[PDB]
Amino acid sequence: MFENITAAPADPILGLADLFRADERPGKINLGIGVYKDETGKTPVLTSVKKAEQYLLENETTKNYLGIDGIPEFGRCTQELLFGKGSALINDKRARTAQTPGGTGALRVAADFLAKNTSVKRVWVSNPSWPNHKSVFNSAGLEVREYAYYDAENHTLDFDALINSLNEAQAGDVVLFHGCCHNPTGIDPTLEQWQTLAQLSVEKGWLPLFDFAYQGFARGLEEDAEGLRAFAAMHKELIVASSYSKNFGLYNERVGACTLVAADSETVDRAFSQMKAAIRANYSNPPAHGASVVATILSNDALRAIWEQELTDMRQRIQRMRQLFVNTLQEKGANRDFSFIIKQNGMFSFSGLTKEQVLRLREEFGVYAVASGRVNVAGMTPDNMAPLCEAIVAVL
């Protein structure tokens, strides 16, 4: 029966990573997958995390199953991060949070939930966007439409095109938004634009779904959440999928959360029970380690202070690389202006290099980037910057 199966293509992202491991020539440079790297080019485990892990090793007395929705404290802490310590949504108990295996996992349970318990038939995602967004919703049988986002001429947010593009999104339609650090453009709406979108959203009857994979990598923890909070004060219902993979360096421990918000405590609880049924029929209950670490850090004032410092250093090193990248491009002889790179937020920068050029950099200079022209700025170091910039100039 397996002879009739047609092979699946390779992940445009995850795929690339196996080729890099395959590449034999010395000097290779990996600017693909979005993982943080320090000056030495390594993806270390944070000190705050090693601390928490030692604490768990000393005090865990059992590995007994967690509830379907995971660690209680985990949910409370994420709700504060997202909505604010004294949020009204929290005080009125309008939100429930389920611990999931990564942000991907939060997007999937949200999708299974919507497919089986609502009349939602369509989800609108931006173009471009993280490739896996479409695969996640399709797996639940939801049709996925796309709206305009990037102005490739001005390297800015094409707001007028975005608004017009969404004119055909109906009441009951789900509309996906990147909380901050849009992947892959790096362009986020301003507070004013968010507020406008918030208003248009209510008037149109959309169900907002926020994907928050980089809280803290743009301006800061509180700042990066302004868009969402402007939506939260305007909406009755909304969903948010968050990930702690990047801001805690916990990638392989799959720590994330899916937060449900309804009009009142009674409705959200009723809806949440169904979200749990969807989880039960998927993986039954969430992996404890990663979430234990995060909850331990967010709850301890000493660990928390350390972690915040580590996130700040991660954020600043990336911005520093953005500057050094643009400067070195000039010094190496690039006539194309790359100034826009400094205005982008987060790990990824939309270089604007053509698929052809990307393939040339890979097979001819040993430099890897996603075929969309997206390049990981977090992967740039003082040591590979020159070789990197020199290659790009060559393909220009």
Ligand X SMILES: Cc1ncc(COP(=O)(O)O)c(CN[C@@H](CCC(=O)O)C(=O)O)c1O
Residue numbering of the annotated binding site: 34, 130, 183, 374
211 binds, among a copy of itself, ligand X, none (CB under 5 to 8 A by kind): ligand X
Residue 274 as a binder of a copy of itself (CB under 8 A): the answer is: yes
Q: Does 45 bind a copy of itself (CB under 8 A)?
A: yes
> Cα–Cα distance between 161 and 150 in angstroms, integer?
9
- Residue from 77, 95, 112, 226 touching a copy of itself (CB under 8 A): that is 112
Using alpha carbons, select from 2, 5, 45 the residue that is nearest to residue 251.
45
Q: What are the DSSP calls for 275-331, one per residue?
A: HHHHHHTTTSS--HHHHHHHHHHHH-HHHHHHHHHHHHHHHHHHHHHHHHHHHHHHH
Q: Which of 280, 336, 343, 355 binds a copy of itself (CB under 8 A)?
A: 280
The binder of a copy of itself chosen from 41, 90, 132, 220 (CB under 8 A): 132
Question: Is the Cβ of residue 196 or residue 274 nearer to a copy of itself in the bound state?
Answer: 274
- The one segment of 75-83, 150-158, 159-167, 282-290 that binds a copy of itself by CB under 8 A: 282-290
In the complex with a copy of itself, the residue whose CB is nearer, 77 or 293, is 293
Give the tokens for residue 135: 């695969």
Residue 105 binds to a copy of itself (criterion: CB under 8 A)? yes
Binding site for L-aspartate: which residues? 34, 130, 183, 374
Instruction: Point out which residues bind ligand X (CB under 6 A).
Output: 13, 33-34, 102-104, 130, 132, 178, 183, 211, 213, 243, 245, 256, 284
Is residue 333 near a copy of itself by the rule CB under 8 A? no
Tokens representing residue 156 in the block: 């800015």
Distance in Å, CB of 212 to a copy of itself, minimum: 16
Tell me the angle at which helices 385-395 and 355-365 cross, rounded to the nearest 10 degrees: 130
Beta strand residue intervals within 48-121, DSSP E: 95-101
Residue 18 touches which of a copy of itself, ligand X, none (Cβ within 5-8 Å per kind)? a copy of itself
CA distances from 7 to 2, 4, 249 (A): 11, 10, 33
- The residues, ordered by sequence, that sit 6+ positions from 107 with a Cβ below 8 Å of its Cβ are 133, 136, 137, 211, 241, 258
Q: Give the distance between the most distant pair of CA atoms in the chain.
A: 63
Tokens of 324: 């050094």
Nearer to a copy of itself, 38 or 160 (CB): 38
Active-site residue numbers?
Answer: 130, 211, 246
Q: Supply the minimum distance, in Å, between the C-beta of residue 34 and ligand X.
A: 3
